[PDB]
Amino acid sequence: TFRTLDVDSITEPVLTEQDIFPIRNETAEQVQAAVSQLIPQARSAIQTGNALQGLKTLLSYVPYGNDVQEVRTQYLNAFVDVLSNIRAADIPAFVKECSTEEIDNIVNFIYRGLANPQAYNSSVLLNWHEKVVEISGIGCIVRVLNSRPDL
């Protein structure tokens, strides 16, 4: 019977996410190289005990795209490993000196971490969430709700 045939999907094509969010102006191998330069700096900053500078350097660029899940998950592995190695007393002094765009990137990537607890320690991500929202306010979560879907 006719009632179940989807005509709308072919007679009125809906907006795509790239009609809402601008296309990435970098190729997949170009962003994969840019992150592969940063992950070794982020790992090295843990060994010198400077994990705060490990985050400040890792956070200087972020990968996005549905074509880059492998390097997005490698960047998230490094991000959660860096956040797990910062001492909990350093967080308030570091968060107040981040820009609004660095804060937006921190609260975005703690959200990607909280989505996968079998890989990532939620206990440190929730501690970071409490302190980032306490110091920078509710609007940083509002910017994550509104953020791009391929971050």
């Binding site: 809906v14 959200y111 989505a115 607890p117 939620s122 994550v144 709700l145 509104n146 791009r148």
Partner: protein, 168 residues
């Protein structure tokens, strides 16, 4: 209860309260109608990105959000088979009353134990800070409610044992 749950329920509270910036919005696909857009998904520009808050692999929130509606869904602690039965049936009595708890769904979304739909109309006609207080007070107490139900089940298993075994 909130010493172990405090970091988690603070992240849930903060992001549920950010997510409830709701508005009246009529459908772009149907004329003279409005629908909770998170529940239909037919126009993606007015959907906000779905956020997961999590304590544990077993204890999770999904917050789905839109111009006129939030869907909030939770996985709750079920560490043994008694708790799997007790939780499932408690959520079925609680969702069976959903007309009187106006922000409940009648069914959970798949892979979640209970679910809530807060619409534009609920933020207009109810105190929305008391809606997020009800969500977090439900999440704070449900583990103590379910553990007390397995104490009542233990206490009855003793009642029938002592009644039976004392009439030889």
């Amino acid at each position: 209860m909130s010493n172990t749950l405090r970091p988690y329920l603070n992240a849930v509270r903060s992001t549920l309260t950010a997510s409830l910036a709701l508005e009246e919005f009529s459908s772009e696909i149907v004329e003279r109608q409005s629908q909770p857009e998170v529940e239909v998904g037919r126009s993606p520009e007015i959907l906000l990105k779905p956020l997961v808050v999590s304590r544990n692999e077993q204890e999770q929130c999904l917050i789905e959000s839109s111009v006129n509606s939030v869907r909030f869904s939770i996985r709750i602690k079920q560490v043994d088979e008694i708790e799997r039965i007790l939780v499932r049936k408690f959520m079925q009595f609680l969702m069976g009353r959903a007309e009187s708890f106006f922000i409940l769904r009648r069914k959970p979304v798949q892979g979640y134990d209970i679910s809530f739909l807060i619409t534009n109309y609920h933020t207009e006609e109810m105190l929305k800070h008391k809606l997020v207080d009800f969500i977090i007070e439900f999440m704070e107490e449900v583990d103590a409610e379910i553990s007390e139900m397995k104490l009542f089940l233990n206490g009855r298993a003793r009642l029938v044992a002592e009644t039976y075994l004392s009439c030889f």
